[PDB]
């Protein structure tokens, strides 16, 4: 009958992405800590508090879609990669979650984008689309 | 062992310690002979222990890595690192897959710093991340 911290986090991370992708705002808000802290390190942005974070998601323009590609859970921590279609762009997200008392306490979002590789390793690389992660 | 988790945690830790320490024989030894490295952002793939070792050894600059998060989950790991290279500060996120106590798959992401799109100024604070160090 006893669920480990890890399995609780796994279930919660799954629900976070399912309710987010479904724009199921009441259910999404209910899994966030009142003092949830969101960071986008790439842009040096932070959002604090469930109210502001919910608004940020609700006010977000365009028609986006995510599909979870990896989901790791380890104690209170999750790391999740997603394929994102953001408008016309194919993107990847890597999101770190921290869970406290069965609620999402921290969200740290990374949104890596395609880039041209630096020269010097042509002899070691094969150029081919990645197996799971979609930039095209 | 009921799960591979703690074995994966140690292996992921050693992968980064030896890589950062340029301890090449120890680093090579924890790679599968058939290790596959991917950089999905650049659509690059490197296959095999020899070529992957070579990629790491030939990489230029006085790079230094510090692990900021390390999650282990059965045979999988997710690790974030702060990389310093000259004046530049970059962040890596790496997914590892383990087969037979060796690193079998490595998937690197190097998300680049960018300027945020307008429209959320009233909801966001402009402040550097707690753990993740960009220039």
Largest interchain contact: A-B, 50 and 50 residues
Main β-sheet of chain A: number of strands, strand sense, barrel status?
6 strands, mixed
Structural class of chain A: alpha+beta
CATH topology annotation of chain A: Nuclear Transport Factor 2, Chain: A
- Supply the number of helical segments of chain A: 3
Name the strands of the widest sheet of chain A in spatial order: 2-1-6-5-4-3
The proportion of residues in beta strands of chain A is 35-45%
Protein name (chain B): SnoaL-like domain-containing protein
Domain SnoaL-like (chain B): 12-105
What's the helix and strand layout?
The structure is a homodimer.
Chain A: H1 5-21, H2 25-30, E1 32-40, E2 45-48, H3 50-58, E3 64-74, E4 77-86, E5 89-100, E6 103-110, E7 126-127
What would your notes on this structure say?
- The structure is a homodimer.
- Chain A has 136 residues and is an alpha+beta fold.
- Chain A has one domain (1-136): Roll (Nuclear Transport Factor 2, Chain: A).
- Chain A has 3 helices and 7 strands.
- Chain A has helices at 5-21, 25-30, 50-58; strands at 32-40, 45-48, 64-74, 77-86, 89-100, 103-110, 126-127.
- Chain A has a 6-stranded mixed sheet with strand order 2-1-6-5-4-3.
- In chain A, a hairpin with a 2-residue loop joins strand 5 and strand 6.
- The longest helix of chain A is centred in the N-terminal third of the chain and has 17 residues, at 5-21.
- Chain A is globular.
- The N and C termini of chain A lie far apart (44 Å).
- At the A-B interface, strand 2, helix 3, strand 3, strand 4 and strand 5 of A face strand 2, helix 3, strand 3, strand 4 and strand 5 of B.
- Chain B: This is SnoaL-like domain-containing protein.
- Chain B: InterPro entries: NTF2-like_dom_sf, SnoaL-like.
- Chain B: Residues 12-105 form the SnoaL-like domain.
